């Protein structure tokens, strides 16, 4: 559901950031990996709550890079 999808989107952002701060991926690779997997998640659970949350987590991800 909405809440489980949001949990997965946040956990994905944290996984991507951890790879990036470990040096395993660069900035653009981090953006790409988040965009690809979160788009999977949003299309599977397309509620407005999920779309909004994913855009917000993308904004937090980009700020932290």
């Amino acid at each position: 559901g909405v809440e489980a999808a949001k949990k997965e989107i946040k956990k994905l952002k944290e996984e991507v950031l951890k790879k990036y701060k470990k040096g395993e991926i660069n900035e653009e690779e981090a953006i790409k990996e988040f965009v690809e997997k979160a788009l999977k998640l949003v299309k599977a659970v397309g509620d407005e709550a999920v779309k909004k949350f994913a855009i917000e987590e993308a904004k937090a991800l980009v700020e932290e890079l």
């Binding site: 900035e27 953006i31 965009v35 299309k43 779309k51 994913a54 855009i55 904004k59």
Partner: protein, 65 residues
């Protein structure tokens, strides 16, 4: 969600105009791609390099569709 994500990041970056954000959201695929490429160029010109990168990836996604 891709269109809305591009419109939101171009808004936050100030890379597009209100009319252009609306045409990103509710225009044709080709004009959405065109305006996103413009927003990429405009955001990089304004020093929003991370947002330019994010928006470039989303436009690649619009093409892939």
């Amino acid at each position: 969600v891709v269109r809305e994500a591009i419109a939101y990041f171009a808004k936050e970056a100030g890379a597009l105009s209100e009319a252009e954000l609306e045409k990103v959201k509710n225009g044709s695929n080709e004009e959405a791609i065109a305006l996103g490429e413009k927003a990429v160029a405009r955001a990089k010109a304004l020093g929003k390099e991370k947002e330019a990168k994010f928006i470039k990836v989303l436009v690649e996604e619009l093409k892939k569709e």
